[PDB]
RNA sequence: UGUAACGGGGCUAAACCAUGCACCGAAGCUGCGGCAGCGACGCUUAUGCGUUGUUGGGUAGGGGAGCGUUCUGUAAGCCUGCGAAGGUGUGCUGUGAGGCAUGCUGGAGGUAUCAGAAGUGCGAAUGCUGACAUAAGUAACGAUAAAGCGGGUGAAAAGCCC
RNA sequence: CCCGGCGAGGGGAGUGAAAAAGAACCUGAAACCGUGUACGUACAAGCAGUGGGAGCACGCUUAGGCGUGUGACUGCGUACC
């Protein structure tokens, strides 16, 4: 039971406070 | 010489869980939580072995103070009178006498009053 | 009909013909022991201690058992400091039955 | 949106206390055939208020 | 361990622990952090130390009367039954027979006797002397012992 | 008498069947039967079949007079579960558990 | 041996009447808390309610020294956005003269199930009459 | 955000200044019982002490002494089908890791003492594998082209056939 | 043989030293999920324990307690790494 995840995620506006 | 640790590990876990008997939830079922609960109970038991002595000391003083005041004297005055009269009865016996034997306590306060005066 | 006496650093109030547990004593299990350090004797009439330890009051007691108390587990644990310690203790006790209380 | 600690079996049972079903306990007996049936419902054989209504 | 060096998954992004190979010792089916290798456990013992221990052992056997010296010990025919009878009347059941000269007749007789061993003076080891309850040495066997022990 | 009767590896989940079991616990067989007959649950017909079998076992293998029988004990235990893969969005996979259960009914005349 | 502990079943509780006319609020309240807790009895036990029932009469006649009659303020929050309400000593006396005495005793007693239990023994009345004559409420001078 | 600048009640002394005598108050000190380390002496001389004084909070770390597990010799010896290992309770026992006896299941192996060698002890490493919980009987059941009725078969029909 | 849908599954009977050895089969631990019994719990606030402790239910000698389980109330107490 491994099920590798190949899901990239969108780059949100970085905090850069 | 491969060594399997199934038997020993199960023995240790059983010993801890047995000591955790009666605790609520995972504290009596899960070893990871039971071990913390058992250790904490050990710390409290060590600490309360000392608090018990002072807790009972406070209870005896309160009982003596109530009994002495009922006889017409403050606790601090009553104890001072006993010291002056050279009486070595401790608080545990004094509280016990006050609860059960009222006449004996009346004699003690009378003795304390005489020593003070 | 009871008396108060000092045996093992802590005072006991014992009535006639009752068993009292007190600290270990250097007495064999089948010999009578004396307690002349009677703090107070109580009866229908009351007698106190003008001087500590009355004047002639004594208590006759017979040793019964010389067992050990219930095991007590001592746990010392320092939080986050990689220090744990375990210990056990069984306190020695002596059971003695009061046979006679003098005046 | 998601739990921070897993609820205990105690909380699970407490929530489920209201999920218990209730028995009808209201079975009426037909006037003629004497067959138990739900109130205001036809019997299995097709009777209602005594008179046969299905005839099948 | 049979396998490949490919990383099971990428270093970052995966929600699980960093992994480098399927053959890591903390992984199932492949590992062993410190695998054993064929090694020699024999250790050196000085010649004098070996002789001294052997001399010490022989002396104490004599002291505990566990050592019996007799004349020539031989069996007429290669029969285990004869050897059993010869040891039966001597009240010996677990004995180590040491003879100056090794004869096939005595060797074959004691071959099927577990509790009985037949040996030559040259082929004497400390373990055999300690292990066996009784040791029987022939007159010839005794002589060669001093010569080799010196 | 014991006259137990059980149905093992029922497809229904233990939780769902357990609601029906609590309805008839401790009741007489006559009242239990028609209670299940008019209960609108799949577990109702599973439990009813087990209860019918228990009554038949008592009547045949044990003493007669099934009129005075009661369901002394009834409990549902979780059974083996079948693991299935169900595709989800974004090429994700999740496990579907087809949960079974054992239904045990005990009836006695005392 | 084991120290004596009062058993709640076998506890005798007496009834007393206290006239609260011309009495300092705090000093009267302090005495009431002592009686309600049972600390005046030789069988006092912290975990057992050994106290006695006390009836207080003439609550509206209680006295306070200094300017406390006008400067003393009782605050309570209603659990709302700005629900903080304050009442002076006169306003409390006009509205419910008994509440001030109860508030004083409330704060002089332990907090917990046992503290609430012993508080229920107190019975404060504004007038000079009480309907508890069936309890043989002997007068207590204090 | 709510009294919110005595911890609270409350206090005109239950505040402050000066003096005095009492009492409470710690795991500090003393009393009683027990254990261990270190230095002395009277004497045992590989060890107890009629004794004596003192010490015993502890991380990094250094030193000392032990428990238990698998395997080798002792051991073709010993225990064991009137019951081994393992499992599960109970009762004793040691300052500790542990040990001993036994009820029920189990069904044929186990191993004293003394030495020898370690794949020798797990709660954590977003550790690895399997199993099982939680959210939860919740979301959802995959195009809003749409179903209704009669009969048939069947244990059972909104979905099958007509 | 019986319940069931000429099912699944089960209860009897029989085989066997043993069927909670029935093929989902030696031993069968833990998490997890249940039924029964005793006690507690619907006016009481927090690392859920610890010290004290009434009541109740079971057994023991004695007729008082001792043990086992539960535990109202109360002092102290903010997990581990």
PDB file of N, CA and C in Angstrom, chain G residues 48-82:
ATOM      1  N   UNK G  48     -16.884  17.084  53.859  1.00  0.00           N
ATOM      2  CA  UNK G  48     -18.231  16.774  54.320  1.00  0.00           C
ATOM      3  C   UNK G  48     -18.870  18.064  54.805  1.00  0.00           C
ATOM      4  N   UNK G  49     -20.152  18.238  54.502  1.00  0.00           N
ATOM      5  CA  UNK G  49     -20.878  19.439  54.903  1.00  0.00           C
ATOM      6  C   UNK G  49     -21.382  19.243  56.327  1.00  0.00           C
ATOM      7  N   UNK G  50     -20.595  19.697  57.299  1.00  0.00           N
ATOM      8  CA  UNK G  50     -20.937  19.575  58.707  1.00  0.00           C
ATOM      9  C   UNK G  50     -21.589  20.834  59.261  1.00  0.00           C
ATOM     10  N   UNK G  51     -21.896  21.807  58.412  1.00  0.00           N
ATOM     11  CA  UNK G  51     -22.423  23.067  58.882  1.00  0.00           C
ATOM     12  C   UNK G  51     -23.855  22.960  59.361  1.00  0.00           C
ATOM     13  N   UNK G  52     -24.399  24.110  59.736  1.00  0.00           N
ATOM     14  CA  UNK G  52     -25.726  24.217  60.316  1.00  0.00           C
ATOM     15  C   UNK G  52     -26.555  25.254  59.568  1.00  0.00           C
ATOM     16  N   UNK G  53     -27.871  25.062  59.596  1.00  0.00           N
ATOM     17  CA  UNK G  53     -28.776  25.970  58.903  1.00  0.00           C
ATOM     18  C   UNK G  53     -28.892  27.280  59.669  1.00  0.00           C
ATOM     19  N   UNK G  54     -28.748  28.395  58.958  1.00  0.00           N
ATOM     20  CA  UNK G  54     -28.760  29.725  59.556  1.00  0.00           C
ATOM     21  C   UNK G  54     -29.844  30.546  58.878  1.00  0.00           C
ATOM     22  N   UNK G  55     -30.691  31.187  59.680  1.00  0.00           N
ATOM     23  CA  UNK G  55     -31.713  32.104  59.189  1.00  0.00           C
ATOM     24  C   UNK G  55     -31.296  33.518  59.564  1.00  0.00           C
ATOM     25  N   UNK G  56     -31.271  34.407  58.576  1.00  0.00           N
ATOM     26  CA  UNK G  56     -30.887  35.799  58.768  1.00  0.00           C
ATOM     27  C   UNK G  56     -32.119  36.665  58.554  1.00  0.00           C
ATOM     28  N   UNK G  57     -32.423  37.507  59.535  1.00  0.00           N
ATOM     29  CA  UNK G  57     -33.592  38.371  59.504  1.00  0.00           C
ATOM     30  C   UNK G  57     -33.155  39.828  59.444  1.00  0.00           C
ATOM     31  N   UNK G  58     -34.013  40.659  58.854  1.00  0.00           N
ATOM     32  CA  UNK G  58     -33.750  42.089  58.731  1.00  0.00           C
ATOM     33  C   UNK G  58     -32.513  42.348  57.875  1.00  0.00           C
ATOM     34  N   UNK G  59     -32.483  41.757  56.681  1.00  0.00           N
ATOM     35  CA  UNK G  59     -31.349  41.958  55.789  1.00  0.00           C
ATOM     36  C   UNK G  59     -31.220  43.420  55.385  1.00  0.00           C
ATOM     37  N   UNK G  60     -32.347  44.090  55.149  1.00  0.00           N
ATOM     38  CA  UNK G  60     -32.311  45.475  54.699  1.00  0.00           C
ATOM     39  C   UNK G  60     -31.784  46.427  55.766  1.00  0.00           C
ATOM     40  N   UNK G  61     -31.659  45.977  57.012  1.00  0.00           N
ATOM     41  CA  UNK G  61     -31.149  46.814  58.089  1.00  0.00           C
ATOM     42  C   UNK G  61     -29.647  46.664  58.299  1.00  0.00           C
ATOM     43  N   UNK G  62     -28.955  45.921  57.433  1.00  0.00           N
ATOM     44  CA  UNK G  62     -27.515  45.767  57.586  1.00  0.00           C
ATOM     45  C   UNK G  62     -26.835  47.124  57.427  1.00  0.00           C
ATOM     46  N   UNK G  63     -25.705  47.290  58.110  1.00  0.00           N
ATOM     47  CA  UNK G  63     -24.983  48.553  58.156  1.00  0.00           C
ATOM     48  C   UNK G  63     -23.588  48.389  57.572  1.00  0.00           C
ATOM     49  N   UNK G  64     -23.079  49.463  56.972  1.00  0.00           N
ATOM     50  CA  UNK G  64     -21.732  49.506  56.416  1.00  0.00           C
ATOM     51  C   UNK G  64     -21.075  50.804  56.866  1.00  0.00           C
ATOM     52  N   UNK G  65     -19.812  50.720  57.268  1.00  0.00           N
ATOM     53  CA  UNK G  65     -19.092  51.890  57.743  1.00  0.00           C
ATOM     54  C   UNK G  65     -18.532  52.695  56.573  1.00  0.00           C
ATOM     55  N   UNK G  66     -18.166  53.942  56.864  1.00  0.00           N
ATOM     56  CA  UNK G  66     -17.586  54.796  55.847  1.00  0.00           C
ATOM     57  C   UNK G  66     -18.607  55.203  54.799  1.00  0.00           C
ATOM     58  N   UNK G  67     -18.105  55.494  53.600  1.00  0.00           N
ATOM     59  CA  UNK G  67     -18.940  55.859  52.466  1.00  0.00           C
ATOM     60  C   UNK G  67     -19.344  54.655  51.626  1.00  0.00           C
ATOM     61  N   UNK G  68     -19.104  53.438  52.118  1.00  0.00           N
ATOM     62  CA  UNK G  68     -19.466  52.248  51.360  1.00  0.00           C
ATOM     63  C   UNK G  68     -20.950  52.218  51.030  1.00  0.00           C
ATOM     64  N   UNK G  69     -21.781  52.880  51.834  1.00  0.00           N
ATOM     65  CA  UNK G  69     -23.210  52.929  51.560  1.00  0.00           C
ATOM     66  C   UNK G  69     -23.514  53.546  50.202  1.00  0.00           C
ATOM     67  N   UNK G  70     -22.620  54.384  49.679  1.00  0.00           N
ATOM     68  CA  UNK G  70     -22.797  54.999  48.373  1.00  0.00           C
ATOM     69  C   UNK G  70     -21.683  54.675  47.390  1.00  0.00           C
ATOM     70  N   UNK G  71     -20.484  54.347  47.866  1.00  0.00           N
ATOM     71  CA  UNK G  71     -19.358  54.075  46.984  1.00  0.00           C
ATOM     72  C   UNK G  71     -19.229  52.608  46.606  1.00  0.00           C
ATOM     73  N   UNK G  72     -19.768  51.695  47.408  1.00  0.00           N
ATOM     74  CA  UNK G  72     -19.678  50.278  47.081  1.00  0.00           C
ATOM     75  C   UNK G  72     -20.499  49.981  45.836  1.00  0.00           C
ATOM     76  N   UNK G  73     -19.885  49.299  44.873  1.00  0.00           N
ATOM     77  CA  UNK G  73     -20.507  49.012  43.587  1.00  0.00           C
ATOM     78  C   UNK G  73     -20.420  47.516  43.329  1.00  0.00           C
ATOM     79  N   UNK G  74     -21.536  46.924  42.915  1.00  0.00           N
ATOM     80  CA  UNK G  74     -21.592  45.523  42.526  1.00  0.00           C
ATOM     81  C   UNK G  74     -21.694  45.431  41.012  1.00  0.00           C
ATOM     82  N   UNK G  75     -20.712  44.786  40.392  1.00  0.00           N
ATOM     83  CA  UNK G  75     -20.685  44.596  38.951  1.00  0.00           C
ATOM     84  C   UNK G  75     -21.057  43.162  38.613  1.00  0.00           C
ATOM     85  N   UNK G  76     -21.816  42.996  37.535  1.00  0.00           N
ATOM     86  CA  UNK G  76     -22.107  41.677  37.000  1.00  0.00           C
ATOM     87  C   UNK G  76     -22.248  41.801  35.493  1.00  0.00           C
ATOM     88  N   UNK G  77     -21.773  40.790  34.776  1.00  0.00           N
ATOM     89  CA  UNK G  77     -21.817  40.769  33.324  1.00  0.00           C
ATOM     90  C   UNK G  77     -22.899  39.807  32.859  1.00  0.00           C
ATOM     91  N   UNK G  78     -23.655  40.221  31.848  1.00  0.00           N
ATOM     92  CA  UNK G  78     -24.746  39.424  31.306  1.00  0.00           C
ATOM     93  C   UNK G  78     -24.310  38.521  30.160  1.00  0.00           C
ATOM     94  N   UNK G  79     -23.022  38.480  29.845  1.00  0.00           N
ATOM     95  CA  UNK G  79     -22.543  37.675  28.737  1.00  0.00           C
ATOM     96  C   UNK G  79     -23.008  38.155  27.380  1.00  0.00           C
ATOM     97  N   UNK G  80     -22.989  39.467  27.149  1.00  0.00           N
ATOM     98  CA  UNK G  80     -23.364  40.025  25.856  1.00  0.00           C
ATOM     99  C   UNK G  80     -22.320  41.034  25.392  1.00  0.00           C
ATOM    100  N   UNK G  81     -22.587  41.714  24.276  1.00  0.00           N
ATOM    101  CA  UNK G  81     -21.568  42.552  23.649  1.00  0.00           C
ATOM    102  C   UNK G  81     -21.029  43.583  24.632  1.00  0.00           C
ATOM    103  N   UNK G  82     -21.914  44.254  25.361  1.00  0.00           N
ATOM    104  CA  UNK G  82     -21.498  45.270  26.308  1.00  0.00           C
ATOM    105  C   UNK G  82     -22.290  45.197  27.593  1.00  0.00           C
TER     106      UNK G  82
END
